[PDB]
C-alpha cells in the first residue's frame with residue numbers, strides 16, 4: 001500500500017496473510033472455515049494467518065491454520081487475470097473474536113464514486129521497494145469504468161473495476177495481492193493488478209466480487 005497509513009492492530013480483523021514460509025498474499029476471511037483471495041495467489045503449502053498486525057512479530061492474537069484445500073475460479077485466465085479469485089478452506093475452524101472476524105459478501109455491486117478500504121502488507125513505495133511489517137490501509141473511491149478502460153484499453157473485463165486516484169501517489173501494490181477492498185461494509189473487491197504502483201493514470205485493478213457471490217456460496221456449500 002502506497003500513500004496509505006497504519007491501520008492499527010487488528011482494526012481490519014477480516015484481513016489475513018497467506019504464508020508459505022513468508023507472507024506472500026492477502027486474503028479475506030468470509031466465515032470460520034473459508035478465505036477469499038486472488039487466483040494469482042494460488043500455491044500449495046499455504047498457511048492462513050489470522051489476527052495479524054506485525055507479520056514478523058508474534059503479538060499474541062494470531063491464529064495460524066493450514067489450508068486443507070484451494071479452489072481457483074473455474075474460468076480464471078492467468079494471461080489476462082480475468083476471474084482473479086480463489087477460495088481457500090482452513091484445516092480447522094478459526095476461533096472468531098474481536099481481532100478475528102469475517103467480512104460480509106455483497107448482496108449487490110457497488111457504484112463508481114463509492115469510498116472503499118483497501119489494506120495489506122505490500123510495498124509502500126511508488127518507485128523502489130519497502131515492505132511494512134504492520135498492516136497498511138488506504139481509503140480509495142471506485143473509479144468510472146470508462147476511466148478504467150482508458151487506462152488499460154482492451155484489458156478490463158466486466159469482472160474488474162478500478163479504484164484509486166488518477167493523479168497517482170495512492171494505491172495498492174505488490175504483496176497486497178489477494179487482499180480486501182471493502183465498500184459499504186461488504187467485500188466488493190480483491191487486490192488484483194495494475195501497471196506499477198501509484199503511477200499517474202494507472203489506477204489499481206480489482207476483482208469484482210459481486211459477480212462471484214453465487215459461485216462462492218455454492219462452492220463453500222459443497223466443499
Ligand SMILES: N=C(N)c1ccc(CNC(=O)[C@@H]2CCCN2C(=O)COC2CCCCC2)cc1
Nearest residue numbers: 040079080081172173174192193194196197204
Ligand atoms: N494497484 C496496483 N497498482 C497493483 C499492481 C499490481 C499488483 C500485484 N499483481 C500482479 O503483479 C499481477 C499478478 C500476477 C501478474 N500481475 C500483473 O500485474 C502483471 O500482468 C498482468 C497480466 C494480465 C493483464 C494485466 C497485467 C497489485 C496492485
Ligand SMILES: [Ca+2]
Nearest residue numbers: 054057058059
Ligand atoms: Ca504477528
